[PDB]
């Protein structure tokens, strides 16, 4: 068995965008004709040039190999011009071929991934979404909390939102009071409309240093939020650290962080108790169990980013459904439209939680025509900073 | 001075099996005569099993030797077969042993076995039980339970009301868990006043991040302890709630060996201590542990859910340690017993007969097999 | 897919007796067919109740289950009458099953498990021996020097011996003078006698306090061993990195560990750069995998342990070729004699290396029949210590 | 002000190929004509794709904003995406950007850039070689090659005797790995003595119990340094090699930003900061780099495997720098650039000139495409 | 390009004096001719005294040299006599000096000292006050 | 009892020139009639200009105060401007005010100032001197720094200090030459060849180092049994200067670079250093280097008084030494003969190799006026120096 051939796809998203503005996917075909499937998250160029990155790894890499090495491909490239050192934009083109070698071995052995990696420990996986639709459902606690119940009725069990301000690429810094209110405000009335019925997740995206993080913190604890996400940024857990301790919040992180050395310091640290690897960056569908087991070994559970498209969706809920430590599944609203449409049979969505496929691999195929059909044609990339310093 | 012989009574736990379903005695006999009980606590295998896991240690370390020699014994016991490292399956099978030298090493000195280890030190032992008959799921129920509990005489009940308690612990409390774990200590609390401790009582359910959260809602009715808030392999995570609340963490009933309880007390993971001398590693084990919480501001509280021959131990241990806090208990306990364990007021008073100050009656724990 | 049977075997070891006194294998069966092998590992009891503890361990968890829910598996296993704690008793039962479940995971994907497990890494697998004999290779270093001699003349590029003197139930104590000086020898003359052809693996058993480990590697150094093995006892890592910290040979300890708990203290703690896991207690295959990935984040390799049957041998050789961070293997000797006889196909032992089968699961099987023929007739368990 | 054009170069290193097989080099023009150079390190793809990489960043976070504007500039592109955290792929493109920037910001003043940021302190720079059956496994050939840079004056030399570097590290040191290291470092040591140092450059090869036991082979001989002891990811790891031994731990050539700096000095996980310029994020985080290292008894000694731009820009704040120790030094690297960088006696001797002091041949440059 | 001269002025502050009694300016001039100004902070003795300590150090470490050569400037003041740590009467007088040290070199390249150590980042910088009457 | 006048001394040090190049005396006068004197150990500025600011302070602080009253002068001092924090400019003037207060404190009582900060302790006190001469010569020549040495043994001197690890410059720290390395080894051994164990080696560098070119330095001199390694890195982070102590065997001694008991706190606490070097004209007074000497009792180290300057600094840390149990050895500059003698009107008392306490009230000697008003400095330069 040997990898042969890739063919990568630049998607673009429709209205309404939810999930982003592109997707990235990867296509491996052995010589035999086996077909595996997956998605590169990484936003640090052009997505024309990562498609065009994920070639010049795979004919440097992968072509001639036998998809079940993935410890020998994943170093190959790791180590790669001398730099074995997390680095996103390799780690996140090697997260891709990494999952469809996956599909690949799970096709060929007529078993879900999951059940090489541990096997099945979910029949369901816990759901959540933000929440979705001059004031709105971003800026107004009344509307946000309407968009809740709408989604507790839906069955969700957890939502999110950012209601903390604007994120600038002069981070961290300190939340206004108008921040501090309006941000309270979203939890006070969201409580209020959903009661025990599902968890607050505070989706914030490192705004803060550590004190304005406490600042913040500290409104926050009455209404019982299950996580604060990335509170500061990503560059030294240490500090993200005495946020943690400060707060009886959870912390939540990782959708910005890859390889397993980077999980191993957040963990040790203990700059959060809830790992957030997206799949389609931290390393592939190994590297995530790899991490996966280390939370295990703090006292931490596991929460897949997802902000991308639906293979990245497929490896998350490859991971979820073998890991005894899995919290919750982030979803783009309950996987329908366009999410739908990408796949030969869709993500099954009942209740508020994912139905895990039990199909070989990734458990459901890109429609490859549906991927070809809906070319990117914007100029940007799939997400950005403010790059005007923070208010004031 | 020799031991000879060893029986082994698998005993059932009849309705409404308060403290498990079954219990798994031992009887030891030396040459010229002398007769020691006890009890293992283990459940990681069948007590079919553990009674013939009993008899092969008994056989290997323990026939043939002086029942004074406890360190001998034990470090036989602890390293045989190249392993020498705490195991609950071995240590287990040896607290029950060990319980019964002690027995015999009273009896034939004529003295108490915790005369023998620093002396008396309390003349009643503060009691404390779990609310029993929902119980289980209702506050106001419960509040009614601890105030009948409280006319008893008990100056403190336990109870759990955090959910339920996987194999894939630790997890996160729901919304719903952590507002029936607040509604139980506010109703229970406006029932009892200040006339009765409130022992939250958690079986390792959740991660440090989600103790964290459910402790925050709980500190405001001074609850004595916190039991368990995270499973037992890291101490120096739950070293992590006990530092952010100001209740105590209360651990160990998983435990074994001065060694794990060791790093309990130096990364402060709790300050107070559940030994359960059926799993501990015995009475000589548990009393030095006991003087290792005397330097690190740390009380014991004797852990019991089994048999009447572990509790009575755990009466030999507690009264002689200055460190003590209080002790658990609970009927068919008092008939399996020669004579039964004297109970006042929420205080149990220690028997004054050499060794564990008790016999089992062995007539009526064969008359009941599992 | 599910699990129907479970067949013990209590297998004697026939002299020269190295590697032990008795095995302990597992046979697990699905309901359509497919057979796996395994290996238990534990002395806590004699081997006739270890047998007894695997079926009662297979009743309660793991009949009717699917072999592919390791993870279940494990955690029913692992969480039974609430303790979810290390247990070398528990988890040595654990391993063997959890073992034979990835032949059988194997078996169905036809492929070898490592294969499913991060794949091939190494195509040879560098082995090392203790010195055996044929006033003797024990206890003189120049005897010991001669072994060693014929060890690498044999292909070996790494031997293994203890010199530093009995290992009692009351260790930790301290080196007598004696101890210290026979350590040394022992250094000196197999280094004159392997010269750069081969690595010292320096093999204490838990002998010393971590003051009297010190005392011991600060004359050892010299001789640069690859490693100082379990040099204090295991109850507190704390304690070991004590001595890690303090010496320039690498510390390995790991063969009386289990659970992924045990290992990240150890590895957090830094009291070793040389994990030694033994896969028949150390709780299966894919907690292993998991334990090497986390010393991965932490400059620590692996070096499986092995003194017991094939079948752990054959686990750790499937562990080993998957693990881009491993060291070196055990063996014993070759792989010739009984270890050869109690396999469908014997462990391919070449010039100095351990050669993986590709044949599906752990890549070989039992031979029932050898298996049945050799049962332990004795009293004594695995291994002990001194009083 | 503002920045108009960009032009990329992927030029071939002819034999000995000593820096690499090809250099990447790139050209920034202000709207009024100023023209900055710079070189971009990036192996972790391939040239006309890393090319193209340099030419998305610029269109999306430089073109049309001034080169002055550096901290923007840096912060615009570190976060894109919404990524902000290291990334040497990004960081390297980043850092020739950046260069460029400061050659026609230092033009525009008339001055070099070291004068902008702290002033000449240096009249010379202290410069090291690597040595070149052989000088990479004969430990006499070694010494022989070491004698001859010596008599032309070079005070130091670098040499990695340690081993093959594989894929897997890090491992272990073979026997036969730390016979030839000390053998190396004795031999050369005669063969030098107090003429120049001795700066042992392994290659991220060991674990950490395995490059203890090699330092304790090589104190002895007093070696300036232990280069790159371990792999990267873990400096806490790292400085418990820097604290067994009394060797100075040196790393950073696989390093980038402020941020890992930072964390490589705070754990004390070596002494001997060696930023490449084409690869740690520019001229002025290095510079922030390098003050860091002041507060921390730590020194800087820019790493070079590669073209002369990313030398220029070695030199530049190597002049200006308090903490500096030694340069690496190095033919063809002359004639790309418009007057040769000046080397006499073991010392490299900084341009008075402009912006990084020289300019890049465009002319050799397109005379040279990689194949 | 070298340091000449240097003028000092001790200003005092008129009511209601908000921000303390009195300044302390410097100016500093090249041979050319191109003019500096600079603060110091230093009350640790009467200003009359600290006027007299900038001159000082200006003719000891200053004058001759190039006011582009910050760092040699500085190592020079903050090591002389023997002492390179943290004294508040030292660094006031640093300060000053290094301030227009920095006003020279920006009006030599015709920019902003902001323009020459990163660059524009702020359009406007938010501000506060004190309370007052 | 009242303080009423001051007199500032710029004194210039005649050849050799040995403790640098001039002393700052004061002189201060209770209305009474009482006198005090001490001397300010400051170079940041000249020394016409530190006098100034003696007068300035002793005007602002001790003017028509009672110089009993130490801890009101020094916190009024420590804290005149909102600084309130070390700076050994302001530090070394408060220090030589409140070491004349002592003078006149001792005089009042009619005790020497160590009979009131906790008593005699010590009937001599041992001393030390750097080697010094009367290009191959004493500072870079091994053999010619043991004959001095010798030299130095046969007066009496149980110990010689010595800085052969070169030079330091305004950018250190920096990393040893193999030279310096190389030189370095040379002095110990031949020093110790030539002394045997009748004197122990102080290895006195002046900060040059980074912290792993000390340890390198270190493990090339552990072996000649070094009493200690003087300051081995710069004093700004003590937590750094805890490396080197760790690492080797030789005790680090520091600080005569540093001031306020907030710095040797530090310097204990990291264990920094072991044998603690204060200048008492520097230190901030006579009473703080008892509160240091104090702490150093609580982390197992000891003090041996740092002098390079003028003899009534050393009047004041003799005045320490004598009332300190964990005193350790004291720093002499020659054997206190020449204007070390001239400037007193009875010169110190050394014998064999140790300094006699005199029993004399207050500091225990008087300075002669008339000999520091007949040597003033004509000099431009700062008492020490760097290279750059
Ligand atoms: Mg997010
Ligand atoms: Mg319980
Ligand atoms: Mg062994
Ligand atoms: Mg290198
Ligand atoms: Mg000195």
Known sequence: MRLSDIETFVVGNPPPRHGGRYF???????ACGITGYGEIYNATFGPDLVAKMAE??????????????????????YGAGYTQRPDVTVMGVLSGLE???????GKAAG???????????????????????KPNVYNDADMAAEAAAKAVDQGFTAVKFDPAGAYTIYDGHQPSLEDLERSEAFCKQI??????????????????????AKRLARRLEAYDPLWFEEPIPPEKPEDMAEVARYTSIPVATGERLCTKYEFSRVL???????????????????????????????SAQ????????????????????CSPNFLVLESIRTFDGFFAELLTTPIRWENGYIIPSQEPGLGHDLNEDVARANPYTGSDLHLGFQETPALP
């Open 302 to 321: 596991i929460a897949p980013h997802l902000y991308c498209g639906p293979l990245v969706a497929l490896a998350n809920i490859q991971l979820a459904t």
């Open 24 to 30: 990235i996917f990867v296509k491996l075909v052995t």
């Open 99 to 105: 999952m469809a070698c996956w599909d690949i071995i």
């Open 111 to 133: 078993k879900p991934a999951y059940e090489l990696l541990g096997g099945k420990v979910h029949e369901r996986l816990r759901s959540y979404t933000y929440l979705y639709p």
């Open 56 to 77: 010049d790894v795979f004919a440097r890499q992968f072509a001639g190999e036998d998809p079940h090495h993935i410890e020998k491909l994943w170093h190959k490239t």
């Open 191 to 212: 409580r209020a409309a959903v009661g025990t019925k599902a968890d607050l997740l505070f989706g914030t995206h490192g705004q803060f240093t550590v004190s304005g």
């Open 268 to 298: 040790e640290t203990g700059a959060a108790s809830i790992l957030q690897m997206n799949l389609g960056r931290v390393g592939g569908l190994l590297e995530a169990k790899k991490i996966a087991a280390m939370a295990e070994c703090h």
